[PDB]
């Protein structure tokens, strides 16, 4: 006869992950590399979104 | 955890899948030898050139067979297996049955083939429907013209439209609708949070994800058992059509049917098989009474007061 | 005043390429042949989503305001074209009642028919074509801009000409994707019994 | 492929993903699924040999004494020009058999002996003699008259299950 | 017999399958649990087993509707092919049909079809008709032939 007995199946060789190439970061230098800071009475606040 | 149901489905589809070649074998492979016509074509004036092989192509299908192959029309574990008899090996069979019919008649069905001149084959054929041999010979070129006209009209009919082959294009459609419906059922939810499996595996922890996949499995496994049940029933319709085709190719091609209305309209003379994609087509050739006259008649006649009856036929008075 | 929408307001309802296929979908679509409200100024409801179309020769319409209050008290979307650049921002704005704070999003860059679809967060789709009262025809509104801005909208305004407004509804549209990737016809399945037939069959031609 | 600039994924008829746009470089990538197929152990009886051929259904041999076929890749059968009758069927016109120093062989099956018939516009063959012959034909007529008592199948020895079966 | 035995043996083996219950034997669910916890576990086995009988009985109904079509074929042969002489080519064995003899078998029937087969043949020259007195003659039965 011609008995069908198992399935052949190619395995994944390696993983790939893809996303858009780096642009539009938050302005961290204008907080951490700044030339001016608040008095502790009057803390600055800046919105990151 | 559901057990043998997966194997039982592949066993059920393998019952169908083997049977599709058993059908195609018992319909076409009714002959031990591949018969061939001579290069000469002295078939009494009958022009079988439109139904015999054409050598100009890699697969030597006839003129009418290529009308039939023209008028008729994915990876989720589903696989379409190939037929055992590829369509040239079908066409070698329909070549053999047809060539043996023309240069033999029924005699290649009954055993070893015996040649006969074609206008003597038809002489018997006509005699097989109670029309005496001389009715062929007194009309032979007219009969060949009526036949050549009728085969011509088949080509024009098959050239015009696909609507005649609805009997085959409906099979191709239903099998393709069942395949699409089975694949589309992968995108259904069945009461789970996604129809994608890696979503469920990644977005949830195993105590929850293994319930969401009991949902998808108890849906999916019933999606297959429904498809395989539809295929087993569909296949049992097609089995009964393969056995009707095998019955016609036995009685209606390899013989001469006395069975009324079984082998087209008319009194049956002979028929010519032509292959088609997933099917077969018979050209039944039939004698049909046309022009007619009214007569006076009697069951018997008196002479010496003894009563006379015909051996064959009937008495008529013209008036 | 009012005008027939005809076979307009069809937009690509997903970022998915498909070619030579009749893709049926159910979402916020403009009911075919419905009567768009016709203007030559006011403040309008937004409902579930808006088809906005304008016919121009003159760049008179420049953009829109959207929200629930439209007089500060809470955040409101503003979209504006002016001279060399276009502007988008979402502050708790004060406005005039006749125009012509907490800024969580901000950005800066008849013979015309312009067409737009606005729906909820907020998505813009559109098309622009030359013409020469809204024309009988078909158009495929492409997605332009996605705003993750979280703004509730029930009302809106035009910033300044003929323009037309109608409300999108949850209907089933059979969309004909053509050759090298374009929508090119549609059937609104609830329109008439032949459209119910074309959506039963998933076909644009119906046999006897 | 020519996706419109905003289209990111390509879809086929059966809702398969046929292509994707790369998000960094605007090229469209065809997706072909990973190759898979049934493995078929083509064999004579173990009462004859332990040689087995293997058919990898619908696959270029590369991904697996090797033969490429319309059915897939066939391994361990010799490709033979001689067309015999079918013995073990394979598909797409191919059959295979165990033959002589003995191996499995694979070939296009013959449909039987060919015969150009001696037709003419004057000749008839007539039998001078006959054979009577007896041919067996076999037909099934009935099944085993099986009967499965659903209750004693599903809930055998339990009223405490039967109360739920109702 | 093989198809019925593969259908029964699979139906029996499926009694031992879990369907997601804590045991594939019902008396283990009943001995290890109280009724409020048992009805969650037993319903798994009922939902599964019942799908296993619906499957088996559908096969037997489809199958029996094939065996029925083989029985009605045997009843048509035992009428026309035994109780008569059917002129229906290849229906009643290869050859011309003379007669047949039915023999029983387990779950079936077997025919000894007896057929006349043409065997030893010679080529003859032939003609469709003959002339003798300007009128044309045809055979009542058979054919004209020349021995050479
Ligand atoms: C048999 O009839 C066919 C047509 O059905 C003839 O084939 C055509 O012959 C003409 C010349 O008479 C050619 O111009 C065509 O091109 C042929 N058609 C094809 C499809 O080949 C055939 O010649 C006739 N043969 C006899 C012996 O009469
Ligand atoms: C959906 C709807 O309101 N349609 C109406 C239509 O019935 C009416 O005949 C027409 C009059 O011009 O105005 C519009
Ligand atoms: C005029 C006005 O109401 N401004 C509001 C303020 O009251 C609220 O506390 C703040 C929250 O961040 O957003 C701003
Ligand atoms: C139906 C149609 O217009 N197809 C066009 C084709 O003619 C053109 O060559 C190609 C260019 O990429 O774009 C597509
Ligand atoms: C599709 C796209 O925008 N690709 C750009 C590429 O052209 C550029 O060279 C790279 C710089 O790192 O950033 C990315
Ligand atoms: C069935 C099929 O397409 N097989 C292909 C063959 O045509 C191609 O030449 C080869 C390239 O290595 O890969 C394999
Ligand atoms: C399987 C096999 O033996 N194939 C051979 C082929 O290699 C050879 O070229 C040909 C010559 O006609 O005969 C055949
Ligand atoms: C007339 C004639 O030739 N008859 C022969 C017969 O003698 C022979 O015994 C038989 C073998 O089956 O074949 C026939
Ligand atoms: C600028 O500030 C960032 C803070 O994210 C730091 O990573 C970087 O090294 C700094 N560079 C200099 C020159 O201060
Ligand atoms: C457009 O209007 C904005 C105010 O919303 C203004 O700040 C901007 O400078 C104007 N554009 C140009 C090019 O002047
Ligand atoms: C949006 O506005 C409606 C009033 O029409 C209100 O009931 C609903 O809660 C609001 N939703 C949000 C998210 O602001
Ligand atoms: C093998 O075949 C022989 C017949 O040649 C037979 O007698 C023997 O019992 C068979 N054995 C098995 C295990 O099938
Ligand atoms: C019939 O004629 C052919 C030659 O065409 C010859 O080979 C064959 O043997 C002849 N048959 C008989 C029975 O003599």
């Amino acid at each position: 006869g011609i008995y069908q007995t198992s399935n052949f199946r190619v395995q994944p060789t390696e993983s790939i992950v893809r996303f858009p190439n780096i642009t539009n970061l938050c302005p961290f230098g204008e907080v951490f590399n700044a030339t001016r800071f608040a008095s502790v009475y009057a803390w600055n606040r800046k919105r990151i979104s | 955890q559901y057990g043998s149901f997966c194997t039982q489905l592949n066993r059920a589809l393998t019952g169908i899948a083997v049977e599709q070649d058993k059908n195609t074998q018992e319909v076409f492979a009714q002959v031990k030898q591949i018969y061939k016509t001579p290069p000469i074509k002295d078939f009494g004036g009958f022009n079988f050139s439109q139904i015999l092989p054409d050598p100009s192509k890699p697969s030597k299908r006839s003129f009418i067979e290529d009308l039939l192959f023209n008028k008729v029309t994915k990876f989720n574990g589903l696989t379409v297996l190939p037929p055992l008899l590829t369509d040239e090996m079908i066409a070698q069979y329909t070549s053999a049955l047809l060539a043996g019919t023309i240069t033999s008649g029924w005699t290649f069905g009954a055993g070893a083939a015996l040649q006969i001149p074609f206008a003597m084959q038809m002489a018997y054929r006509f005699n097989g429907i109670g029309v005496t041999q001389n009715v062929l010979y007194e009309n032979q070129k007219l009969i060949a013209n009526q036949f050549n006209s009728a085969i011509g009209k088949i080509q024009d009919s098959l050239s015009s439209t696909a609507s005649a082959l609805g009997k085959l294009q409906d099979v191709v459609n239903q099998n393709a609708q069942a395949l699409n419906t089975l694949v589309k059922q992968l995108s259904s939810n069945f009461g789970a949070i996604s129809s994608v499996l890696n979503d469920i595996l990644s977005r949830l922890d195993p105590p929850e994800a293994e319930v969401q996949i009991d949902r998808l499995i108890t849906g999916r496994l019933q999606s297959l058992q429904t498809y395989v049940t539809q295929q087993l029933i569909r296949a049992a319709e097609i089995r009964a059509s393969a056995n009707l085709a095998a019955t016609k190719m036995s009685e209606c091609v390899l013989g001469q049917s006395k069975r009324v209305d079984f082998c087209g309209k008319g009194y049956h003379l002979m028929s010519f098989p032509q292959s088609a994609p997933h099917g077969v087509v018979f050209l039944h050739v039939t004698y049909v009474p046309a022009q007619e006259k009214n007569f006076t008649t009697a069951p018997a006649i008196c002479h010496d007061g003894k009563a006379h009856f015909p051996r064959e036929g009937v008495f008529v008075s013209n008036g | 005043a009012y005008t027939n929408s005809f076979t307009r307001g069809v937009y690509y309802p997903d970022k998915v390429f498909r070619s030579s296929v009749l893709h049926s979908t159910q979402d916020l679509f403009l009911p075919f042949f419905s009567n768009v409200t016709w203007f030559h100024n006011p403040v309008l409801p937004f409902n579930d989503g808006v088809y906005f179309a304008s016919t121009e020769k003159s760049n008179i319409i420049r953009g829109w305001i959207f929200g629930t209050t439209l007089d500060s008290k809470t955040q409101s979307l503003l979209i504006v074209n002016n001279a060399t650049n276009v502007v988008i921002k979402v502050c708790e704005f004060q406005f005039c009642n006749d125009p012509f704070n907490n800024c969580t999003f901000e950005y800066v860059s008849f013979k015309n028919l312009r067409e737009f679809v606005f729906k909820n967060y907020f998505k813009i789709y559109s098309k622009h074509t030359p013409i020469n009262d809204l024309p009988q025809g078909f158009s495929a509104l492409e997605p332009l801009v996605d705003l993750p801005i979280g703004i509730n909208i029930t009302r809106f305004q035009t910033l300044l000409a003929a323009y037309y407004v109608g409300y999108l509804q949850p209907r089933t549209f059979l969309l004909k994707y053509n050759e090298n990737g374009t929508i090119t016809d549609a059937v609104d399945c609830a329109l008439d019994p032949l459209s119910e037939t074309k959506c039963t069959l998933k076909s644009f031609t119906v046999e006897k | 492929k020519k996706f419109l600039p905003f289209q990111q994924f390509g879809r086929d008829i059966a809702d398969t993903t046929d292509a994707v746009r790369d998000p960094q470089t605007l090229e469209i990538l065809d997706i072909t699924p990973c190759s898979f197929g049934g493995v078929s152990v083509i064999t004579p009886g173990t009462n004859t040999s332990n040689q087995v051929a293997v058919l990898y259904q619908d696959v270029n041999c590369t991904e697996v004494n090797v033969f490429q076929t319309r059915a897939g890749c066939l391994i361990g059968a010799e490709h033979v020009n001689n067309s015999y009758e079918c013995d073990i069927p394979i598909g797409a016109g191919i059959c295979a058999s165990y033959q002589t120093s003995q191996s499995i062989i694979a070939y296009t099956m013959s449909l039987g002996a060919e015969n150009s018939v001696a037709y003419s516009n004057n000749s008839i063959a007539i039998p001078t003699n006959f054979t009577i012959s007896v041919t067996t034909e076999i037909l099934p007529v009935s099944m085993t008259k099986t009967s499965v008592d659903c209750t004693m199948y599903i809930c055998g020895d339990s009223t405490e299950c039967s109360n739920l079966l109702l």
Side-chain angles (χ1 to χ4, degrees), chain B residues 148-218:
Chain B
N148 293 345
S149 174
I151 295 290
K153 291 179 183 181
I154 301 316
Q155 300 202 342
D156 293 359
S157 186
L158 294 179
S159 180
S160 174
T161 182
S163 60
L165 282 78
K167 294 186 177 183
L168 305 178
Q169 181 60 95
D170 177 39
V171 170
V172 174
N173 284 358
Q174 285 182 44
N175 302 331
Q177 283 181 342
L179 285 163
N180 279 334
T181 307
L182 176 61
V183 174
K184 287 179 180 182
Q185 282 288 77
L186 292 177
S187 72
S188 295
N189 281 319
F190 311 100
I193 54 96
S194 180
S195 59
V196 179
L197 182 56
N198 289 319
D199 289 354
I200 295 159
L201 293 170
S202 62
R203 278 205 167 202
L204 301 180
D205 274 39
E208 308 181 334
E210 292 187 30
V211 180
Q212 294 297 306
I213 297 161
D214 274 324
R215 293 226 156 138
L216 288 190
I217 291 170
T218 314

Side-chain angles (χ1 to χ4, degrees), chain A residues 6-39:
Chain A
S6 283
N7 282 264
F8 168 77
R9 183 185 304 103
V10 176
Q11 296 293 4
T13 66
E14 63 197 271
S15 296
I16 285 174
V17 185
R18 300 292 279 173
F19 291 105
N21 61 4
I22 294 169
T23 20
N24 296 337
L25 278 68
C26 262
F28 290 122
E30 308 176 346
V31 180
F32 289 95
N33 289 337
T35 56
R36 296 184 178 169
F37 280 80
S39 69

Side-chain angles (χ1 to χ4, degrees), chain B residues 32-36 38 42-43 75 77-79 81-86 89 92-93 102-103 114-118 180 183, chain D residues 14 33 36 57 71 86 89-95 108-109 111-125 127:
Chain B
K32 285 190 176 183
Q33 293 197 322
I34 299 297
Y35 296 113
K36 290 175 169 178
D42 289 2
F43 304 137
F75 308 103
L78 276 51
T79 61
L81 311 181
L84 182 65
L85 287 167
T86 48
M89 300 170 78
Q92 287 179 39
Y93 271 140
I102 293 161
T103 86
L114 300 166
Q115 76 277 359
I116 185 171
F118 195 91
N180 279 334
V183 174
Chain D
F36 72 94
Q57 296 168 13
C86 203
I90 287 184
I94 304 300
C95 296
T108 285
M109 67 173 186
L111 307 185
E114 60 197 316
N115 187 342
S116 65
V117 188
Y119 178 84
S120 71
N121 41 352
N122 64 19
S123 185
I124 190 172

